[PDB]
Design an enzyme around this catalytic site. Structure first.
Site, PDB file in Angstrom:
ATOM      1  N   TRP A  80       0.791  -1.234   0.000  1.00 42.37           N
ATOM      2  CA  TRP A  80       0.000   0.000   0.000  1.00 42.37           C
ATOM      3  C   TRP A  80       0.831   1.297   0.000  1.00 42.37           C
ATOM      4  O   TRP A  80       1.563   1.515  -0.966  1.00 42.37           O
ATOM      5  CB  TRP A  80      -1.229  -0.042   0.935  1.00 42.37           C
ATOM      6  CG  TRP A  80      -1.073  -0.142   2.437  1.00 42.37           C
ATOM      7  CD1 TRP A  80      -1.467   0.801   3.361  1.00 42.37           C
ATOM      8  CD2 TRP A  80      -0.594  -1.264   3.200  1.00 42.37           C
ATOM      9  NE1 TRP A  80      -1.218   0.352   4.637  1.00 42.37           N
ATOM     10  CE2 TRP A  80      -0.690  -0.910   4.572  1.00 42.37           C
ATOM     11  CE3 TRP A  80      -0.074  -2.524   2.859  1.00 42.37           C
ATOM     12  CZ2 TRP A  80      -0.293  -1.773   5.602  1.00 42.37           C
ATOM     13  CZ3 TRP A  80       0.329  -3.386   3.890  1.00 42.37           C
ATOM     14  CH2 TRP A  80       0.214  -3.002   5.243  1.00 42.37           C
ATOM     15  N   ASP A  81       0.735   2.129   1.044  1.00 39.11           N
ATOM     16  CA  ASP A  81       1.430   3.433   1.087  1.00 39.11           C
ATOM     17  C   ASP A  81       2.867   3.346   0.574  1.00 39.11           C
ATOM     18  O   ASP A  81       3.674   2.598   1.118  1.00 39.11           O
ATOM     19  CB  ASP A  81       1.512   3.981   2.511  1.00 39.11           C
ATOM     20  CG  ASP A  81       0.158   4.202   3.167  1.00 39.11           C
ATOM     21  OD1 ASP A  81      -0.879   3.643   2.731  1.00 39.11           O
ATOM     22  OD2 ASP A  81       0.154   4.929   4.176  1.00 39.11           O
ATOM     23  N   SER A 127       3.690   4.711   7.651  1.00 45.19           N
ATOM     24  CA  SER A 127       4.232   5.531   6.575  1.00 45.19           C
ATOM     25  C   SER A 127       5.170   6.657   7.004  1.00 45.19           C
ATOM     26  O   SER A 127       5.169   7.094   8.154  1.00 45.19           O
ATOM     27  CB  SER A 127       3.090   6.059   5.710  1.00 45.19           C
ATOM     28  OG  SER A 127       2.342   4.967   5.215  1.00 45.19           O
ATOM     29  N   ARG A 185       1.001  10.416  12.887  1.00 47.85           N
ATOM     30  CA  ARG A 185       1.785   9.637  11.938  1.00 47.85           C
ATOM     31  C   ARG A 185       2.189  10.428  10.684  1.00 47.85           C
ATOM     32  O   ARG A 185       1.802  11.589  10.514  1.00 47.85           O
ATOM     33  CB  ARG A 185       1.015   8.368  11.521  1.00 47.85           C
ATOM     34  CG  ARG A 185      -0.413   8.605  11.015  1.00 47.85           C
ATOM     35  CD  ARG A 185      -1.034   7.288  10.555  1.00 47.85           C
ATOM     36  NE  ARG A 185      -2.390   7.468  10.040  1.00 47.85           N
ATOM     37  CZ  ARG A 185      -3.485   7.495  10.799  1.00 47.85           C
ATOM     38  NH1 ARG A 185      -3.395   7.358  12.113  1.00 47.85           N
ATOM     39  NH2 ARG A 185      -4.677   7.676  10.244  1.00 47.85           N
ATOM     40  N   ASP A 186       3.006   9.780   9.846  1.00 50.43           N
ATOM     41  CA  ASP A 186       3.294  10.170   8.455  1.00 50.43           C
ATOM     42  C   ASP A 186       4.262  11.353   8.273  1.00 50.43           C
ATOM     43  O   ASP A 186       3.908  12.341   7.628  1.00 50.43           O
ATOM     44  CB  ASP A 186       1.997  10.422   7.661  1.00 50.43           C
ATOM     45  CG  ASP A 186       1.050   9.213   7.648  1.00 50.43           C
ATOM     46  OD1 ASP A 186       1.460   8.101   8.048  1.00 50.43           O
ATOM     47  OD2 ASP A 186      -0.124   9.391   7.249  1.00 50.43           O
ATOM     48  N   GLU A 220      -4.476  12.825   6.342  1.00 48.97           N
ATOM     49  CA  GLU A 220      -3.365  11.869   6.331  1.00 48.97           C
ATOM     50  C   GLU A 220      -2.261  12.239   5.346  1.00 48.97           C
ATOM     51  O   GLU A 220      -2.465  13.074   4.447  1.00 48.97           O
ATOM     52  CB  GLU A 220      -3.866  10.449   6.012  1.00 48.97           C
ATOM     53  CG  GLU A 220      -4.933   9.922   6.950  1.00 48.97           C
ATOM     54  CD  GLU A 220      -5.246   8.463   6.705  1.00 48.97           C
ATOM     55  OE1 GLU A 220      -4.795   7.597   7.481  1.00 48.97           O
ATOM     56  OE2 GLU A 220      -5.953   8.182   5.729  1.00 48.97           O
TER      57      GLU A 220
END
Ligand SMILES: OC[C@H]1O[C@](O)(CO)[C@@H](O)[C@@H]1O
Ligand SMILES: OC[C@H]1O[C@](O)(CO)[C@@H](O)[C@@H]1O
Ligand SMILES: OC[C@H]1O[C@](O)(CO)[C@@H](O)[C@@H]1O
Ligand SMILES: OC[C@H]1O[C@](O)(CO)[C@@H](O)[C@@H]1O
Length: 494
Positions: free
Chosen positions: A73-74, A162, A243-244, A336
């Site tokens: 995915w990501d 991520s 996150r991220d 996100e």
């Protein structure tokens, strides 16, 4: 092309100092522009959103980039401080969240790990294999490395989520990621709130004609965890988002390094409240809502934000939180994978959101939401008539969105065709396939979609974007096409 509704909030795009406490708002008035742009007459299974802000439809018969070795995915490329994407010694290199293909696709998030892929640089998308031609290099981390940073070693699950990956002229990789510990019972119920932290691991790329391997990535530095003043903690919200990491250098601020990431506004979940600025209506607007109605609606459970941090040293091992740059209080729970994209002296903040995460009263497609301003901290102007929508999945906003594991009877079959979009140089957008198909005939992806092209600043207007439908085939480029625009040569061999 606009249904009657509220006017968008007036945004100035005025820049502030990165250290200022100014937080731009993506307002309810702004977000309601999404419904205004929607065609209320769109029939079942047709897209109701304008084509210029809709991702081209992805074929349900798609190739798999890993030949079903893993769920993918990501994804992020290898980048410098200007987000240029790199090949090393003739290889394009990417990092992706991956999981055991034996898992049910929806159970993979708590088994997530960071892997890498590589393929020869300098081959045009049409000359490459249909599936993109990537080799799965395997996992970045040896078992038990990423668990290092957690005092509480009682976790039931430990994952890598991520981030981004920086490459130096000397071939050093700084991998910024989300290091996550989960404390779950067998049914999934928390024992304590989960523990997501922004983290760094340093390694090196070894590349020659045999392929790419990685060395290092044996030590993890714990950079940031939610603070409770700027960014919501587990104690405030059991299911807080944090996150991220995306790092970069701001042209306006030479000789410093910044990072954006996803958070939530630091409010206690069940007593969170929104105000007039969060609503953002112009005085007298016939479609204005009251603060009392919104606060009573349930919209207060949607308080996502985009955070900013500044590096305290050159090694990027020490970071300082700055105030949030964007808040979506009573608009969405989830902004996100933020990134800052620099174009024509403007700062574009791009972030992704789900349909289901919108607050009561609001609605919008799955996909890329975007904001323009004159600085990394500015009174950001949501793109495209103040709506915020850059690139949405084809979506009939007149009908229920359904779920990726249960598509709605009346929805466009591409409603969930893509997620974790990432905007690359020249407005090329890469993403992964979640679900394609109708209510009774759908498939799961876990591989990358075709890369598409979004023109940024259409006409003379930096607030406007438009999908380029002449790109590739009817708007669809190469499957899993993550092209390098810069090329590096280094000592790393194996
Ligand atoms: O990068 C350091 C510079 O940036 C500022 O902190 C403002 O954002 C200035 O006070 C300083 O000169
Ligand atoms: O699986 C968790 C990861 O997936 C996302 O939700 C998007 O698909 C990211 O924000 C996160 O890092
Ligand atoms: O540097 C050019 C060489 O590097 C590669 O891209 C990967 O090893 C080869 O396909 C090419 O012959
Ligand atoms: O792979 C099948 C088709 O997918 C595309 O990448 C776009 O959908 C086309 O270039 C190709 O004809």
């Amino acid at each position: 092309g606009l249904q009657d509704g509220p006017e968008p909030t007036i945004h100035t795009q005025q820049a502030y100092a990165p250290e200022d406490d100014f937080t731009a708002k993506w307002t309810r008035a702004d977000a309601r522009q999404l419904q205004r742009m929607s065609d209320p007459t769109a029939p079942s299974r047709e897209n109701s959103m304008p084509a210029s802000v809709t991702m081209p439809t992805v074929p349900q018969d798609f190739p798999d980039m890993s030949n079903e070795q893993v769920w993918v995915w990501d994804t992020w490329p290898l980048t410098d401080e200007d987000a240029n994407q790199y090949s090393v010694n003739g290889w394009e290199i990417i990092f992706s969240l991956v999981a055991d293909r034996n898992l049910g696709f929806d159970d993979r998030h708590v088994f997530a790990k960071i892997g890498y892929f590589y393929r020869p640089a300098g081959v045009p998308a049409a000359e490459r294999p249909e599936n993109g031609g990537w080799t799965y290099g395997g996992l970045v981390f040896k078992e038990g490395v990423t668990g290092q940073i957690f005092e509480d070693q009682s976790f039931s699950h430990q994952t890598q989520w991520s981030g981004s990956a920086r490459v130096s002229k000397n071939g050093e990789i700084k991998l910024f990621f989300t290091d996550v510990a989960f404390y779950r019972n067998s049914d999934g119920t928390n024992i304590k709130p989960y523990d997501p932290r922004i983290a760094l691991s340093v390694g090196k790329v070894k590349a020659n004609k045999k392929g790419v391997t990685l060395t290092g990535f044996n030590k993890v530095t714990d950079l940031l965890q939610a603070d409770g003043t700027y960014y919501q903690t587990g104690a405030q919200n059991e299911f807080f988002n944090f996150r991220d990491p995306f790092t970069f250098e701001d042209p306006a601020h030479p000789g410093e390094t910044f990072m954006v990431f996803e958070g939530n506004s630091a409010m206690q979940r069940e007593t969170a409240t929104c105000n007039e600025a969060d609503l953002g209506y112009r005085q007298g607007d016939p479609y204005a809502e009251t603060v009392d109605d919104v606060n009573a609606s349930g919209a207060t459970y949607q308080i996502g934000n985009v955070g900013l941090a500044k590096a305290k040293n050159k090694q990027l091992t020490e970071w300082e939180f700055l105030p949030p740059i964007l808040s979506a209080n009573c608009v969405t729970d989830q902004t996100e994978r933020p990134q800052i994209y620099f174009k024509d002296g403007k700062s574009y903040l791009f972030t992704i959101s789900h349909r289901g995460t919108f607050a009561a009263g609001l609605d919008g497609p799955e996909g890329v939401y975007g904001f323009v301003g004159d600085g990394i901290r500015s009174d950001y102007q949501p793109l495209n008539g103040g709506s915020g929508l850059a690139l949405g999945n084809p979506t009939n906003l007149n009908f229920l969105g359904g779920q990726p594991f249960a598509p709605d009877f009346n929805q466009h079959p591409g409603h969930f065709q893509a997620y974790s979009h990432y905007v690359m140089p020249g407005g090329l957008v890469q993403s992964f396939i979640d679900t394609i198909g109708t209510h009774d005939d759908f498939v799961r992806g876990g591989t990358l979609a075709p890369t598409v092209k979004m023109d940024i600043g259409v006409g003379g207007d930096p607030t406007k974007t438009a999908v380029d439908y002449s790109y590739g085939s009817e708007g669809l480029g190469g499957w899993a096409d993550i092209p390098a625009n810069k090329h590096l040569f280094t000592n790393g061999k194996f």
